[PDB]
Amino acid sequence: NVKDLKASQRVCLRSDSYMLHKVLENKADPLVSLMMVEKVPDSTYDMVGG
Amino acid sequence: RHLKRELKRAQEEVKRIQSVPLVIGQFLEPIDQNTGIVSSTTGMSYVVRILSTLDRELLKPSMSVALHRHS
């Protein structure tokens, strides 16, 4: 269906008419990738103490 | 028992598709054990079936791979 498909899902195609076949396991989403390249490690109130 | 001999003989035949010439791709990432994702050195990505009885342990870490030109 076209209901299955939504924002930025990497999709399969069969080269002939390029017919869409299946959604791929992996998604590509832009907001996760900018927070990943800055690189800030998780912290806690116990680490701050001082 | 006679079918163990013919599986050998019938498996020599798929091995004979490997031939000069070949075009080089690079195994990007798996998605199944009977299909994976390659990226040809032509600039095109493809989603192609893997040939039976090949090492599934060595494909996964990005490695060079051979493709048959006309498919």
Layout of strands and helices, then pairs:
This is part of a larger assembly, with chains A (50 residues) and B (71 residues).
Chain A lengths: L8 E6 L4 E9 L2 H9 L6 H4 L2
Antiparallel strand pairs in A: 1-2
Chain B lengths: L1 H14 L7 E8 L4 E6 L4 E5 L13 E5 L4
Antiparallel strand pairs in B: 1-2, 1-4, 2-3
Tell me what you see in this structure.
- This is part of a larger assembly, with chains A (50 residues) and B (71 residues).
- Chain A is α+β, with helices and mostly antiparallel strands and 50 residues long.
- Chain A is built from two helices and two strands, in the order ββαα.
- Chain A has a two-stranded antiparallel sheet.
- In chain A, a hairpin with a 4-residue loop joins strand 1 and strand 2.
- The longest helix of chain A is centred in the C-terminal third of the chain and has 9 residues.
- Chain A is rod-shaped, with a radius of gyration of 19 Å.
- Chain B is an alpha+beta fold and 71 residues long.
- Chain B is built from one helix and four strands.
- In chain B, strands 3-2-1-4 form a four-stranded antiparallel beta sheet, with no helix packed on it.
- The longest helix of chain B has 14 residues.
- The radius of gyration of chain B is 14 Å and the shape is globular.
- The PDB classes it as hydrolase.
- The entry lists the keywords Macromolecular complex, 26S proteasome, Protease, Hydrolase.
Short description:
Chain B: This is 26S proteasome regulatory subunit 6B homolog. This is part of a larger assembly, with chains A (50 residues) and B (71 residues). With 50 residues, chain A is α+β, with helices and mostly antiparallel strands.
